[model samples]
Target chain A: YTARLQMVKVLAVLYDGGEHAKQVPGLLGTTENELGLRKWLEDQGHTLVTTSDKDREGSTFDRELEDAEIIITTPFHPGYLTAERLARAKKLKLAVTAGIGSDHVDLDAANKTNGGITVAEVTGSCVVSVAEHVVMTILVLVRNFVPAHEQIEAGRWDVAEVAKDEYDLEGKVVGTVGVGRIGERVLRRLKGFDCKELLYYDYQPLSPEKEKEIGCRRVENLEEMLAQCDVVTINCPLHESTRGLFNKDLISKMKRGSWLVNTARGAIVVKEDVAEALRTGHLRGYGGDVWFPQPAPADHVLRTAKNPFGGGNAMVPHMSGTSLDAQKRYAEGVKRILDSYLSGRFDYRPEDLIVHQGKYATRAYGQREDVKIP
Target chain B: TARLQMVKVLAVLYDGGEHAKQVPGLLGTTENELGLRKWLEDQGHTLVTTSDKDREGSTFDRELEDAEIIITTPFHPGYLTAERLARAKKLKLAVTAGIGSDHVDLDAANKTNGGITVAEVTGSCVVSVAEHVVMTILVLVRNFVPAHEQIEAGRWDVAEVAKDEYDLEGKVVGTVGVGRIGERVLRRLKGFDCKELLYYDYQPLSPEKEKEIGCRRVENLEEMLAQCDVVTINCPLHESTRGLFNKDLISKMKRGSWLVNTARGAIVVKEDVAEALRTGHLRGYGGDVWFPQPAPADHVLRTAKNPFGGGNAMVPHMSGTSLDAQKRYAEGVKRILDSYLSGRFDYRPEDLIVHQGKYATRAYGQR
Candidate 1:
């Protein structure tokens, strides 16, 4: 398979690089490169189309995907590969998540499309970046930094006004929803604050020795842990059992005035319920880089969401894991994954493979015992 | 000698509350004014409180002529010049309600009234100011203010906010003076994993202490400024240190570095510092201390511009005046007055300024 050369069509969807992209050389994840696949693929007689436009009718991304052999998209500016969209891309054999979290692609459809397609992502590429963001968000909310800063910019010098709501993070009970790579890093960074306790809730508890090393306790029940924490950060992945896990019922169990930081996928939370909670002052703040849909509409509920005192919302665009340093790492990882596929060896990092040879490689997408490829 | 006398005490403090209202012991409303009044009055002394300390022909200035004891705060100090000290013929004891007695002329106080004693509540608000210093450093380095403003304005332009945002890690931070507050600032920042911590001081920390804090001592101020990405001013304001951060000294700082001064506003020339921020020589300037309390709306720093258009994080002089610090300092003032009135002269050696017509502490440039 490695001896013969074949022409392949690749479609890449990404966001536009405003200014920093211009300064950084080989910024392949930016829309300017489109797919950054031209130099590597064109040299081997393949064609590439890079675009920011994903869902528009007759757009380049849509028009080119019908005959494309491989597609690459980012979670920051995802091109949702729905069942209907997959049906149109009859010749699509490979889908790559340039960054982590291939939740945009429908795994069930990818396994059934054209005798099965391969799906993989650059895992662990931006975990540290996202972990740092979680710590920043917690401090921003706990310190009441937004309103205090707004007081300065507005020419108002009332210390009592802002200090009334501001608090020290020390001695607060902080907990993480999942103790994955990002969650563990969050706890490690928070250890310096002298917190009352560091709690985590996950199906699999860490080894006793590892837990002692981080000085964190694992709670078997999520609701019970929520009741004890003053600040709860979500570091879990987005999946069937986890999606909408933070709806109205679950949110009610959280201690009043506790902060919630989600650097994970957006669908893990119920947007409207969280907004209402913020409005009622039940939650002190809600901050993260993830929104339900990419390029969140101007009128999104979270945009205007504020606590009763006109603060406690730190929502930004989906950018926690897409820092300049993170971009370079993920871009290089994408090229490495593509190298294996183009050579016909199909050798890929086991952790990066989400779906391959018509079977789910990870349980993150949920059970799939019914579907199998021969 | 421990018995209290019926002495007249004149108190000059910042005005903002109901004066007549008093809560016993834990006096919340009587921040500076009535707190001393209640305690002094209980000891059979007459307490006269006024906020017009600086104005000529005002009650505060007029009351100084015969006041046996004068009490003022750094927040709204009654500037005691040599001429004023001459007029304060009956002034024997001068008490600073809070730290920093630079508002009072020490040379004149030393010669006036056969040596008027000066003292203040020292070390009362060191932790408060140190915590605020750490907070402001993070605020400036993270580009937190602009990102927060974007959220309030109903915008989510990640590229715009993230373009300037940076992690505080791997940056060299140097404190201008390694005093109590400056030392604590270095300790709090240790968790961030900064690349290096440096301090510029006349007296260096011991080698063991330096190793424990992970800081190096720089003998020259200008040399330290060139090596730091962030410089925090924590030295006291005195003859040698006043206007220490003028244009000449500021130019020595690394380009695009940040400056935080919670020490004394007079330490940094207002116009020079503002221009540096405007010209992008400094990336940002953050501190609550101002030359004048309740900074005027037109103060140059209030409108200083940075390349990002919003680098000035100046707030009111409230870092040392947090509710918690205020309570501690207010109580400390009473203790100092108690020592003076009881004639035991049992003031803490650390708090004494000019004792027996000579300098007591080496701080405040009084040898």
Candidate 2:
């Protein structure tokens, strides 16, 4: 009973086109000196196939989908696994996200197909980095820094011109859409700024003592929070309830000339409404690293988004999780999960497993009665 | 005796305002554009412009003494030492082309037989200098220099860099002297959200004015420094203030804090500041002024004693005399000159002629 083991193959379908691709081995318990699936998996007496080509019609992902036991992907450059692809995969056992959020996969289809597949994400992977990024964005936008530097390069000396749009961040009221780990970190870091107040809207209320300790208040309703906040940051996950949550109407409810930052999935917001809000003075600035699809097209609305006076835009690549330190933390965590699964001793708690035994185990996505199978 | 009707007037200004080169009918004295030579020469007056204020036995200083009215700017301020004032006996008026009249010896002017009237374009650059004080505070407190240096180096080590970095929101701030510059500094700083603003000055501002600027007056400078996280110098330089910020006063300041000096170079003992910065007793030091105007290449403050050499944001003495400011003051100086020649007190009430008829008219200080 102690030595009994079954052959397991993990087809990690990741978009390995970026610098983060180098982290895969560290995540999968392999070394740069030792390459290829056979060396790592066969060494452990388990099979592993890593592929960057997840979308190709009949590529390694297609070949590996036949019997891959675990599928791994990242939000940075996600490998979208549609329900149609999940149906073809006969032996798929689990799906793991190396970073937070798993909106790329078709959750409903994964739950209904042959047997539901487990889906889980590494929670709280890079919240601090993202929270720091939010603060940086706030400074860059409120001060109109980019255009001021641009003007300097063009050889202009107009202090009055730059000062008209620039402002100090002392008294603004900053609100967060969700009060999870990342949102709480943002409020704690903001203690020095002496903001008017910190407001957060979430499903459950944080303890009054915790709120008092951090000098924040819980907003009962989203619209009420948006109306009063000078800055509103998105920190919630993207689910049926959250997708397109910041639509035109919700955005219009926000204070005019306010700032909006969304580090969550871009699908949580309607793209055109954000662009329109930026075009008018309704939104003073728009910042976040997320886009609906990875490697957003150059012509993406947000890529071209700018404030009315052509300022308050601070958009960069999805870099919050790819920081050198965060990468080390996440890479080690992923390896631990992979090691436990291969040893036939991966007894993840019910709450921890999103997709297990080929069925969706978590209620992150809407639950369905007919999708479950033993 | 030089007859007034046939004499020519030459003005040696440090470089007039930014647009000084662009006046409608002005000609710089030199073939290299010496500032306002053509305008005076065209009016049948002679103008000689030279950038060299300290050419030993050079023609500029010699000729500078002979002029009926001498004009110099704050940027390249000509230090009219007591000896120079002795030779400038015939000089009827000495006009500071910009703010800060410390470059001239007021005592010697009072002793001259002709009694040179000293005047400056006051309140021209107070706001600019105050704004610079806030900028320097934020740049030092936030550790912006190293953080920005990291960006330029293309490295991202947040923990290593942010160790000394802090926000100014909760810190106590104090100004050594709350005169025109210090009071304006407090007004500009009402927005950064500091925990408290304190100032030490000879004359306390009214409680109403203090409340308006969100500041409190401190009677003791040393006590104020001990409680403040940051101390800024915004007072004038005089015998009372020379080396006022020596080691004893600095030792009294909160440890591991910051100090900014945009007022004058002589106010602080530069060597002690360098020592404080080296030991990390003071987190950083920032300012644009040096003990002597046109400080030599190796001034201690210029080298900045912080671990990161970039902690010193000392630029040449251009903070108080920006190009835009020079123009306004230049015009003000000319107006004062005209009023003096016309025999009227055209001086603003605060800016009065300190002496008249070779005697001290204001005996309040001397008595």
Candidate 3:
């Protein structure tokens, strides 16, 4: 039996929305809006500290995390809950990922390093948002929409230059790294494109009926699927096994001049390898919003990387999942999760759990029950 | 009639001299000549291919005088005006290698030499434009242009683009006309789970076809526009459609809605569109169809921007002529030429825009 909850201190590290937050006040993921949680949490007699200053030293996020019981962060502007910080958060009992992907928190540390913290996210809230992003990124890459738009804005009308690399998504084969929520939606969207075939790489295969309905086949091997795809989208979560899965060696397996999209996480693909592949015309295009170290440096190679023809890079700041609609859904989800904990019901949604009761509680970040921490 | 007369064909196509070489199979360009030079010459037809169109005394105008059957493309049309149509004494047929024969003045063609048949390689550009419609909607809603521009400029400002950015999901998308291309667009959007899909057409889709795509027919164009978060124009360009999307009509659209037109230039009013974008009356305006095919460097839509200094998705008119689409329409053109050359004149019913001086297709609007 759990003891009665006391007035807890919650800290949130969200991205600085600045004028954008002011302009579109509904952008609840920003530090300015703070998920509109300040008033609600305060009303519950729990103090919440929100800040965009999350980088190390004695930053407000670091200072507040020391005594915080629940730490919240967004993938857009995350505060890494390293094992070192997890050690200092002696009072920490739970780590909340504002949107999804609780990879920022060390799953091992959450298991036993500290107070056996529960790691949770607002599951399914941003699934549609991110799925749309995956397809949008795919079109951006394959159609070469960016460079064409670039030519227009530059007051140029070179149809040949723009249409040189432009292609129809109709005949090419498209594959996904995983067939989870986002991946399945992406496949459904691509179905109407009449692609040559839809392929996916996953440990578990879909039922024959489901595969037939979607008109897709499961390729057990990642390289086998990559070799057959003209476009590959990453939809799986980031974890130890999946981390940097699309490195140079694996990327070389992709069909030459193929496009890669990662709405999953930036770390899943090697940035330098992708940049060089684009430079040498090996990969026709590389796109998506996931990037390592939120607020990637100004000189990040992927930022300006282009194919030999001066296009194919579709990188942007971490956004896909934080659309206005998604912000509202995830914001509502976080409130529900917090309410359960505050009310001492402890009946959090099963799907939202990454770690609970000192063990991996979900199969996303790593397989549940099968995960072993040395 | 018995003799295999040499048909003088003036084929007006775009000159992508080196660019055609860039993509090996660019059959739509003048240099490539739809891969028809040898075929036509072997058949003893005089094929004069040139990109020099629209000038005071250009190759197209000079050659128009005696061309027996003029072959042109929507990309770089020969613009057979009434005055020019009168000059072509030997012109019996006007063929469009690509879809959308708006570049040819239909009414004028119908009166010349009793009537000149206007036909295009129809149905070939549907998938291409449908794909472009989805692409432009996402580009504007997702605010992709600015985000990609931000990255290219070596800046990483998420909120700037995100403020204006949106997901096509949970939004109503309506097309002005839902024919083959529009239907394909609705089919493609089926999986995005959009709030609703609407189309304003003269006729309703087959009952089951509408149900299968999960879209409804909108009776009133303005009522449809008022309800849509995004609107696309897929109607043909004709007297009834020219300048259709004007100030008053655009004013009926939702305040922050986005508009996409891969249909044809001149179907929309040039000034009204730029003003709508400038005033933020329309959140974005993406048109592959400019007032003129080769939209001058100073074209307003080329540089139009929304209030946030973004939301402009204008690109050259190459949506339906992608390298893949070019090949299909090119082959389709050969089939049309073959039918006429064989002395059968049995044109594919679908390709006929104006056959026997009557509107053969409902796409260009009712007589």
Candidate 4:
């Protein structure tokens, strides 16, 4: 496997720009960064095929993956790799997540295939981008901005109508579910808001000094924190212990009319349960950038979910982390990861690797024991 | 004439809600007018209320001709120009039911009928307007209105929305005037971790006060505008200040900056601001004030354009008129009227705009 030979085939699964990128060439996910990757790979005598279509049988991504030694995908538009799909990619040696989170790939199957394949992501690439987004969504919901803006577009100015539902963020209690990279950044950014108090619930507590610096208190019990917070944000990573973590039973523990913001993962919440809570006025508002299925169908219940007063859902596409600035960082990160792998050095940063040489590199993914590689 | 029988108080207010039926309707409801009328009638004085302030040959004009005391709200102000003041021959006292007495000519009020007293419920809506300023700043700098609109329109084009989205954490924000409302706006914005907070005023804030708020004073207006990524109008509308933010002044603002005006509608040239937004020289414009209240269906700002076609966050003139602020102003208005009737004339110095043929506050005369 040398740079001089036509040895590697890189298959990239991304979203199509359609006519939008044509008007604005800075759209990085589309023709912008994708073209950069293709040119670089082709210059090194390797083949690259990028496709927005991933699911159908005769799709470009499916055909390209049959011989691809490297596969790339983004969290914004994931290409789910099931066990069955991995069984066909005999030449697949490296699976890369251009952005963060490798949940789209079946990790257990990747370890079992080809003696063991490497799965890595561009870690810490968009944590600040996402932290800012969580704060933005919180203000949007609390201030009742959506309904206020809607009133203007409709050419009706009713101050009393909108003011009845609006509120200031001052002196309100806010909490984050997990204080990881993105979660801690959210607390740091919110310190300026003069919140009444900031709380975080995690299996492990942050140091007392760290807590003081960020002005956040650690609540060991999740439900205890939930009952006290006026706003709860989800920032923990997606894993076995966290999937569907916020079901109906857990949500009932939250204070009535408290807001919930999740930029973590879609499956972490039970969609129907959250929608029902919004309808019943148990939750004041629900906002996030994640959905159970990406490109959420038009009929997605959360798409139309609203509080009793008719304005609390701020559901946007998975965009918080895909900002143009974030896109540039992650794109550069992807190229660095590819350069190391193509050079036969495998000099990947330890934090970026999810699975390597037949076993999970980090415990963040929870325990897995079914696969064995020699 | 005696102290009470010959006096008449005419109040012009906005109508359209049950809150108007209550006499103390503290929320600027039609009821607030009834409340004022009842209090005046109990004192053997006549009270007239109407919402027809803008229309010509209306009942408001007929009532103003003989009213000894005239009370008006900023939400639905009666334009007491020099012409209207000439018609108000018996107008002995002019009261502004809310903040911003720009609707009345202070100089004319002083010269009319042996120097009529002009007063307002000052500091009543300061906190409300300041809070609204912060809300509009965040709404514009974060590109929130357009993002929220994208979701409501059954579309999820993240790229289209995210292209203009930005964080307010590191931008330079400046306030035009550092009065009561402007000072409060800076206090609330102090928590947002902005790169710098700037203010321009004729009388500079004290060194100790400026240090406490973590903001600096800029001596020149154009110097301040060139450095700010976000500019908020918090100055009073007077001779030198009205239309101060016209085309030439706005061109001095940093390209791709945001402007918020919760102070008054006439502070900025409507057409210039709208054109700036369309040219993408100004990234966004967010405010609740318009040149005319109940802005006609075709106000240019109502349909202003931005490069992204969605940065205009214009709402009706409701920022200072929030229900919470209305309660405070309504009570303050009663206190001003009470002071005048008691003949003590012990009005709060801060509330008096004109007294005995001279401007009571330095804000109005550009002194």
Candidate 5:
């Protein structure tokens, strides 16, 4: 049974949670160390080189990836696997996302490059974490919490000032752009809010039981859902059919003064168009924790975009799916995936595979189109 | 009908002249007068509205001399002290347009000239308040304030922001009392995947209800505190609850746990809450209520913070006064007023805080 011992190079790219790892030992998703698999990988006589310098040319990541057999990355700080890079890495056998959303990896490249590299992620590890984030972002925008909290910190006490724009989450029509694992959890949480109606726009309709259970209506036309929703949350993945989905044309169809939350991905919507909508008061608020690039440039437009009332945008660093609890689940999930792959049998869980052996295993990442990665 | 003419009412509401002009939904403001001005005047009643509640010889003080009824709100409350209750010889009814009638002394109302009837729109803003409490808890536990602050400061440090961040899952959550708002809070917490839910109440939830919401009862408040990572105050402010979360009681709480109070500010001593945050004993303290509403500029709670520059999500007393809440409370207040003015005096049993020289409901205790 112990004959399945083999040595291989495992490369992990993660965000530099330099100080955070020391403060919160559970921050196992950080560069200082997250996958927590070094000792286990070392025990098997494997080489583990995880670093934060991912995007630069001839960086440690590229230098180490030349002979690496397995690679792990987080959505928070992606070490993007371009088709060109994947084509060059002759020995790369597996690529794993320690968390959900492997959009950072070019799936088309993974399917065709290196005789079909196997790609997977720790699914459902942070669905509740991200779902809770969606609900919180909706409440924060509708209730005008950021400004209200800001008023207190500035040593001010103007009740009418903050309450003027504040509203209740109840009695408002709330909708989600996609109804998947995270979206389903969000609907369950929002049902208790007693909203006027819950709606969703997905190519795939939910079962009659699920729709009835959650009290949500499936709008076949995305535009139709936009017209009626007071708040909209995007849970769809960033792919061909959805990239730039919430652009000027789609936003124009939304209810005026509505709120939009995207914990999904920043690339799903046109950044400047969303900013303009927020500025003009067409959209009352936009709350998201992701950007086109994880470490978005310092002066990204969404960073300071505000509505006509001077407070709307609720952008933060990509962190909704990276809580301490999430870190632990994905860290262990990665080990399981590595264990099976290292077992010399290549027995991988069917649900964990986005692509394997030159074929699509899941439909989460949109159509079969080439993706450009940095 | 003739008694309707004899009803002289005075209302103390916040000045929302700037807000009400553009947003007609501001039904609680003095300018809007709870949407009651037209109906009251149509009914041949003298209605006076003012924001001048505090200070000597103020409009509220002067108007109360002969007013038969007084209407106030918790947002910009007109405190009805024992002294003020004593001077109002003709005052027959006191109404709170929104929830929480703590601004008016209940004991004083019980003995005010054959017992002035005290009432509020009970359950009017329960949904509103429950939502705000959940929001506050997530904001505190996830460290949203500093994260949003960093975004505005043009900085992106996931580690700095996420250092104090935590997931609501796998953490014990307890409520001080399981009343309407508290129950709603627990039901909403049902989806967060919390480790467990606990409640401290003199009156326990039925076993069926406890099972339905997936919560258990802890008869002792301090015992519940020890097990909870997050504590939300849902009990009313009364003689028994005032300064309840003082130095000694708060010390019993799990170190570095968070506290949320949308119930009232005075329930916990202001100094004690601020000191705990400064000492890093309490990870966070958040709510929309504050002592002496409009909290004076130098109020310590306003600027309280933990070592990580977190904690302190205090805001103006506006949680229960949201525009949607204002509508519900406005309708509720009007319903109560109509019940009183019709000469029937048939106020909803749940709305009464004090009736006929005694406590009307047990929400305030010892009814």
Candidate 6:
């Protein structure tokens, strides 16, 4: 059986605008001639266009906006295209994220654009990095280390200045929301803490063997899990079901002065609500690098959030996927997506294909029935 | 029954001040403070040594100034205060030679008209201090002191210690100062997986450090403490900050949070801190330092009362630098003085001259 060459023109718009922008061609194997996709796509008579100047209102993106068949971007330095731009692109077939999280793509608008664009992310790619970071942020926030070092720099010897904030991690109950790949890794690492118990709330429960092995149990209800856990980590993917999942109503269910860690999408929880929770002492600490858009402005609520004492918060740039090791995996994975797409036989698995032949995939549309794919 | 007489000497000291007394001499300090002079003198070649080292105006300081070689322990540092350091011009060697020499004017001794030798018994009590941190964390989290105090107060309130008492299993326990002692506290705390383990230091550890110890580096202080249930201190006291535990900073810590300081006395702001305890702001305070040695019976900390909520745990200064510790330090101090006396000064790289007569220098910073 001979397959037809669809002439898949791949437009690679990325958030790798910093030092990481340099690695895009290698990871995705595209070129300036073919936008880092030359050799690979030329071998099959396909086309590739890459641009670092996608951030502007009228840059190369405006010129390339109409012809690209598929567009790929990242979570680090994203390119935000509105539904209006999508309507103008008659040939646009799919929108892929080279890393986790698709919040920057305007999912709601993606479903309404002329023929709704297929939106999907490279899942399970950076879970380990985010998991490790979750464990790190929790310890840093809870241990009161910031104050101690501040004292050191201030050239003071008051142990109480820092020690009063120190605490042991032995007895508190630690829980997770949507215990997927990253959440499970967190539970596995937390086993050594000898916590009272480990709990998680997910649409589906873990197998008894897996749960028993990890020494954790599933909470049937999210509220019950939130109310009982001393610390809650968010690891579930954000979709119609989980977006705005951690609003004030849900956050109030948590024990007073509990801690929240979000290595997941920042939009899953209300940004302002979290900052307010931290200020009112309703939440103990919040840490994660993700913001609604990449390169969050200097004044993002989470970035400047502080407790009554000045030391419980820990935030960073989107570094979980940028670890030396994680970068290697993601870079290679992005290349695979291009290799298959340029080969003309880009047979994407059902899960990998968010949109094809003008129909949106279940993964991107979720249960939102009103989101009519144009 | 067993006949083995290896220089029988009597040491008169506060109840737990033997770590210092037992080092040079096999005998430890005694609780009977007044009788030590008469008893030790009866023995020969073994000199009769007694001083009000822990007193306001005791013969210990006066006698220590003229003595050819003086043994000063950290438990009862005969604070060779600057004035005494200046007057003790005849003193060729000054030994602290114990863990902490804060009681001595290190700067004064380094410049004593003729440059007196200053040496401490090093590595004698590092592990002891680290272990003490774990003990203090447990004591405060379990509310052991208040419970024990309640027993003595002839009151039975399980709820008292229980209210504040907690298991170390899941709480985020952090060490404010992680040096030799602080790092050790973290390694030992590993058994407790803690929701998370964190540290903030001037010198960040390598990735290998984060992995091996399972801890994260935090950038801010008040933010870190607001999340901790217990905090342990394991650093030294110096001039840049003598009274660091002031109200402004302590108030930032989580309400009813536990604190453990095993470093120094003058480091904390004592009076306002006591008020914090009484007001139920601080959960508990456990350490072994009082501004002045042999803290008068009326010292604020001595009488500091935690609110009816059960929050006070005060002890005399004796944590880092102990008797079993003194032995190790006494030997180290002797080696240092020996090195100086022999003109072969082979001091540990970490312990060196605070001031080499004309040159003033030290690690972390110069005095």
Pairs of residues clashing in candidate 4? B20-B30, B20-B31, B23-B35
Top DockQ hit: 5
Regions more than 4 Å wrong, model 4: A1-7, A106-119, A204-206, A343-374, B1-26, B32-52, B57-73, B83-98, B112-131, B179-197, B205-217, B321-357, B362-365
Q: Which candidate has the highest TM-score of all?
A: 3
Model 3 chain B scores worst on lDDT over the 10 consecutive residues at: B1-10
Q: Which ten residues in a row have the lowest lDDT in candidate 1 chain B?
A: B19-28
Residues A143-247, model 1: lDDT tens digits: 566666566667665544544445556668999988877788788767756678999987756789979887899998999999999999998877778889999
lDDT values of the candidates? 0.78, 0.66, 0.85, 0.80, 0.88, 0.61
List, residue by residue over A1-374, the lDDT tens digit for candidate 6.
Answer: 54645567877764323322342323331122222445666567667777756656677776786888777776655667667677767787677776676666666677666566666666667666676667666655555444433333343343323333444445579999867777888887677555679999886568899999889999998898999988999887666778888999999999987889887887788989988988898887777656675556545667667776666666655555544334455556666666555455656555555444545554333444433332
* Candidate 2 residue lDDT tens string, B168-191: 655799987777778877775664
Q: In model 6, state the lDDT of residue B233.
A: 61
**Candidate 3 at B353: error in angstroms?**
1.2
Native A-B contacts reproduced, model 5 = 0.66
Compose the digit string of candidate 5's lDDT tens values, residues A56-113.
7888888877788999988988888888778777889999998998888888788888
Candidate 3 lDDT tens digits, B1-367: 3434688888888888788887867788888888888988888888988989878999888999999888888877778888899899998888898898888888888888888888898888789889999988988888877777777687776667777767888899999888889999999999898999999999678999999999999899989999999999988888888899999999999998999999887988888998999999999988587867788888888888888888788888888788888889999999988888778888999999877777788778765
TM-score of chain A of each: 0.94, 0.87, 0.96, 0.94, 0.96, 0.85
TM-score of chain B of 3: 0.98
TM-score of 4: 0.84
Task: Give the runs in model 5 whose Cα sits over 4 Å from its true position.
Answer: A1-5, A367-374
Estimate TM-scores for all models: 0.83, 0.54, 0.97, 0.84, 0.97, 0.52
Per-residue lDDT over B37-84 for candidate 1, one digit per residue giving the tens place of the 0 to 100 score: 667788899988777665669888799998998888665668888989
Q: Put down candidate 3 lDDT per residue, A183-248, tens digits, no spaces.
A: 888898899999999999887567789899999999988888888889999999999999888899
Which DockQ values do the candidates obtain, in the order shown? 0.25, 0.05, 0.72, 0.27, 0.74, 0.03
Task: State in Å the error of residue B132, model 5.
Answer: 0.6
**CAPRI verdict (incorrect, acceptable, medium, high) for model 6:** incorrect
Model 5, C-alpha of A120: deviation from truth (Å): 0.9
Off by over 4 Å in 2: A1-5, A15-42, A56-63, A349-352, A355-374, B1-367
Clashing pairs in 1: A34-A50
State fnat for each of the candidate structures: 0.16, 0.00, 0.61, 0.20, 0.66, 0.01
